[PDB]
Every structure is written in structure tokens, then in C-alpha cells.
Structure 1
């Protein structure tokens, strides 16, 4: 009588409270800095904002009743304390008897976890409020939030294959756009790296947040290129060159990505690199082939950012901005290559 989604949730949070269990509480008291009130505060704050925004009718998302909000918050909290408790019990610092004051006082983890959870309720009630409404409403930087998604699938296995598929698809929304927003912290972190973009040998074959974002970004791109290379039936010897043009743009043109899509730069590298060898496929042969992937809409290649404002079309981008920023490297191939992961 419930849906297979809302049904799993209520089995997930059976006879759990929306409060820490006596085993999460004891890991908290095992800390010099017991983190219970700062965690209890965040949860109050995220909630009061959740409810202030849920219940306000913007002319873009109509506003619903308070009665359901507190229902969608109580649940996201029960899951928080359950996934907090899993996460902390499995932490190899807990397992080697070490003092977890420093893990338990990273608020961006606490805030994105509660966020990730809130998305789970709303996805699983089929909510109007499509991602990324939740991170917007809560002022969360998608660059810092995406890192909780790989923690929550492995710290809650009672999650349907349609919950996970959801969590990986919003993780992919953050690696393809969203985190390359002008206001993202990816730019602050590339700055304190003297603007040094990590390459596919230093991340697939250095550590941190920049390396792990470009590790997941090089992974998503490589996957999307394999499945275009197959559908458009070109060499494994040229694909290994379209990847080195798609690395040149990320690495020696990383502004190109600002307020844009991963796919705009990947598709543009295909056409340019099929043409400077004698193995031509065309932007339509490519539009249609690409048109088939789960992340592929028309806006990506029919509404491309050109000026920062003039927007337009993927071909106008190749002619106005791309040809001029890449032709130098691309025409060296008529010159070392980069390694395709997997």
C-alpha cells in the first residue's frame, strides 16, 4: 500500500529514535571534545531552515504544509543517527581505540550527511523538490557535499538499488556541472594549489579534495567517452587521443569549465580530434550518439555558455571559444599521450 521506496525507508528506521543511541552516545563520551551539542545544534538549525523553505510558496516551487515537513525531518534525523552510528563504529580510529574528537567536529560532514539523508526521504516520497533544492536551501557547496555520497552507500546497505542509482546520479550532476559554478570552492582549492590542475597519472595512478574530485571527474569522463567511442564505432587508438585533448582542456584551459558541462568539452574534443586525424564523425552523428546516455538532455548542446551574458549552441562554442583555445595542441597530431583508466 506504500511504494517499494517509502516501504524500505520505514523498515530502515524501525524502532530507532530521532536521537543518538546509547552506543553513538558512548563514542561521543569517549572523546575529549564530546561533540553531542554541536551536532544537536546543526540539526536544529538545518531543520528550522528546512521547514522555513519547505513551507514558503516561491513562484518556482509551490509551498506545502508544516505537518509533512516535520515528518520528512524526523525521518532524515532517525537515518542520520543510524548512519552516524554505523560510520563512527566502522571508523578504523574507533577500531584502534583512538580519540575521534577531530572526525566528529567537522561540521561540513554533519551538514552534508543530514542533507544527503534529507534528499533520501524527498527522493523516496517522489518529492516535487528535485536535487539540488536541498543543498541550495541549506547553503551547501556541492564540491564538499559529493564526498558524503560514497560514505552513505557503504554505511547503509538496506538502501534499494533505486536509492543508490539516485545517489550516484546526483554525485554525477555535481562532477559534470554544479561544482564548476563561478561560486564553487573548487576555484579556491585550485588557487591554494598555485592553480595546478591534477593530471590522470597523479590521481588515477597526490591526495586531498582536489585529487579526489578530479579522480571522480576523470572517471566519469572516461566512462562517457568509452560509451560514445563504442556507439560511434571509432578506434581505441584515436579514443586515446580524444582523452588527451579532454585532459588538455581540463588542465591547460580549466576556466573553459566555469559555469559549464563536462560533456560540452568532451564532445568538442571528439570532433576536433576525429578531424585532425583522417577519421571524421560530425557534431550531429555525435549529438545523436551522445543523445542516448542517461545524463544527456538538449540544453547541454543546445544552450551552451559563450559570454560572462550570451548563451547558444554547442557548434557556436566550438567555433567562437574552443577552436582558438585548443587548435595549437590538437594540430600537433596530423606528441605524447595520457593514460585511459580501467
Structure 2
């Protein structure tokens, strides 16, 4: 009588407790600074906040019963202890006999892992509490939270294909838009790096959270560009110039991404370097093909931020904003190209 997704989570948590295993308590106990009490305090704070929001009525979502909330929390707590054990056991420092107190005292990792097991539980039950509900409830920055997703996918092989597709989809939402909002910690991370945005070469082939973030952003955008170039039959040499213009906007025009969407910058890189190299495709041509992409929805080309608060279509943005900021770069192709990923 249980859904496939719900039956899978109860298989993964079968006969495990919402407590650390003796193996995890061993690893905790090997540390100069045993982290067990601060992990339990993090899980209780997240638990209280989750239960308060779940049970509180808004007009966007009627609230639900405490009994359901505690069930979801306990299942997420069992998922947390199980995945944390797999991560910590497979850490190279553990295998080399090295104190792991610094790795286990990163609050942002524990909060991110627990929020991600809450997301797995709520998705399995088809909850209306849609990402980004969990990270908004728990005050988690998308720019920090996203890194956990791949750790969870490679750490928990019991996850169904639907669960992994859900987690991959939330990862892309963050890379495409959420991490670029005006109060994203991404801007803080850029600021401390003297606002030097990593280039494709420095990350596809330096290190740190900014480096990881942009390497996932370059990966996601390269894949989306390949499909648009194939559905419009364009030269592989125009693709490399579009990629180089895209990279120019991410590295030298980073402000253009703030409160916007990756795809909006990719399409206007398509148009301006289509035109300058004379391999012309109309902006209507570019857009129709884009609509067939899974992440695409009309708002990406119909509701584009112009001032900060007026909104307009992508063509309006291109003419009012994009062409002035980028024409000096693109007209160098009317030359150095950039490494296109895979």
C-alpha cells in the first residue's frame, strides 16, 4: 500500500536508530574535540525550527500536525546518522589515522546534511513543502547548501532514481538562479577573492568554494549550450565564440547575473555572437528551441529583471542592458577562444 518512494526510504532506514551507531561514536571519540554534543544540539535546533514552521498556518500553506512533523524529523535524523557514518568512514584522514575534529566542527556541513535528509523525506511523501522551503525555514544559504547534494548522492546508493533526479534538479535551480540572488553568500565569497571570478580554464582544468561553484556553473551552461547549438544546427566554431562571450559576461560582467537566470545570459551570448560572426539566428529562433529544454519556462525570457524593480522581455534586456555592457568584447569577432567543457 506504500508508494515506491516511501517504501524505498523505509528500506534505507530499516532497523537503524535516530542516534549515532557505535562506529560513529568511535570516530567521534578518536577526535581531540569530540563533536557528539554539538551535532545533537544542531539536530535539536533544526528539529524545533522545522516543527514550528510545519505546524504554523500560513495562507500559502495550511499547517499540519506535530505527529507528522516528528515522524518526518525522525526519518531524516536516521538518514543523517547513516550518511554521516558513510562520509566519515570513507574520509582519507580517517583511513590515514588523522584527527577529524576540524572536519566534524563545520556547522554548515551538519546543517546542510540534515536539511538535505529532510528534503529527501518530504520529497518521498510528495510533500507540498517544496524546496526551497527547507533552506528558507532553516536559514541556509543556497551557495553553501548545494555542495552537500553530490556528497549525499555518492554516499547513499539506496536512493531511487527519482530521489537523485530531485536532488540534481534542486542543485541546478541553485546554480541557475538561487545562488545569484542579491543576498547570496556568493557575493561575499567573490568579495574576499578581490571579485576575481574564476575562468573556465582555471576550474575545468583555482580551488575552494568559488572554484567548485563556477566549475558546476560552467559544466551546467556548457551542456545547455551544446543542446541549443545542436537544435539550431550551428557551427562548432560559433559555439566556442558564444561560450567565450558567456565566459566574458560571467568573469567581467558578474553583476548582470545578480537576481537573474544563467539561461538569460547564455541566450543573449548566442544572439550577439551569432550576429557579429554573421552566422545569424533570430532571437525568436534561439528562444523557441530553448523552450524545449527541461528547466525552461516562459518567465525566463518574458520576465527579465531590468532595474532595482522593473521587468521586461529578454529582447528588452538585450537592447537596454546587454549590448552596451558586452559589445566592446563581441566586436573583437567582427581571436582568443575559451576551453569548452566536455
Q: TM-score, normalised by structure 1?
A: 0.99
Query: Aligned partners of 1:283 and 1:184: how far apart in 2?
Result: 30
* Cα deviation, residue 63, structure 1: 1.1
Distance 1:86 1:269 in 2: 43
Quick check: 109-118 or 57-66, which moved more? 57-66
3-state DSSP of counterpart to 1:335: coil
Task: Return structure 1 stretches of 4+ with deviation > 2 angstroms.
Answer: none
Between the aligned partners of 1:299 and 1:55, the Cα distance in structure 2 is 32
Residue 335 (structure 1) shift? 2.4
CA distance in 1, matches of 2:201, 2:322: 25
Structure 2 distance, partners of 1:182, 1:320, is: 21
Could you say which residue in structure 2 is the equivalent of 1:316?
316
Moved more, 114-123 or 284-293: 284-293
CA deviations on 1:58-82 (whole Å, 9 max, x unpaired) are: 1212211111110110000000000
* Post-superposition CA distance 1:3-40 (Å, at most 9, x none): 11011000000010001111111100111100000000
Q: Distance in 1 between matches of 2:70 and 2:231?
A: 47
Does residue 237 of structure 2 align to residue 244 of structure 1?
Answer: no
* Secondary structure, counterpart of 2:310 in structure 1: coil
DSSP-derived class of the 2:251 partner? helix
Q: Distance in 1 between matches of 2:39 and 2:263?
A: 38
How far does residue 288 in structure 1 lie from its aligned partner after superposition? Answer: 1.2
Query: Structure 1, residues 70-107: CA drift from partner, whole Å, max 9, x if none?
Result: 01100000000000011111111111111111111001
Q: Deviations over 1:248-280 (max 9, x none)?
A: 100010000000100000011101110111211
Shift of 1:286: 1.4
1:309: Cα distance to partner?
A: 0.7
Deviation at 1:281, TM superposition (A): 1.1
Tell me the distance in 2 between the aligned counterparts of 1:54 and 1:313: 37
CA deviations over 1:206-265 (Å, ceiling 9, x no partner): 110000000000000000000100011100010000000100100010000000100000
Which of 164-173 and 60-69 deviates more?
60-69
Task: Give the drift of 1:341.
Answer: 1.1
CA distance in 2, matches of 1:267, 1:275: 12
1:202 Cα offset (Å): 0.4
Secondary structure of the residue aligned to 1:32 is: coil
User: Secondary structure in 2 aligned to 1:2?
Assistant: coil
* Cα distance between partner residues in 2 of 1:283 and 1:120: 39
Structure (1/2) with the larger helix percentage: 2
Q: Matched residues in 1 for 2:283 and 2:51: separation?
A: 46
Distance 2:44 2:194 in 1: 39
The residue that corresponds to 1:124 in the other structure is 124
Aligned length: 342
Structure 1's unaligned 5+ residue stretches are none
Q: CA deviation at 1:303?
A: 0.6
Query: In 1, distance between residues paired with 2:81 and 2:184?
Result: 29
Tell which deviates more after alignment, 280-289 or 163-172.
Answer: 280-289
- Distance in 2 (CA, whole Å) between partners of 1:307 and 1:103 is 42
Q: CA RMSD in A?
A: 0.7
Residue 74 of structure 2: aligned partner? 74
Distance 1:73 1:282 in 2: 51
* Matched residue, 2:65: 65
Cα drift, residue 293 of structure 1: 1.0
Aligned equivalents of 1:287 and 1:334: distance in 2?
A: 23
Distance 2:203 2:254 in 1: 17
Q: Give unmatched runs, 5+ long, in structure 2.
A: none
* Range with bigger deviation, 55-64 or 315-324: 55-64
Give the whole-Å Cα distance in 2 for the aligned partners of 1:44 and 1:82.
Answer: 17
- Offset at 1:311? 1.0
Q: Give TM-score scaled by structure 2 length.
A: 0.99
Deviation at 1:205, TM superposition (A): 1.1
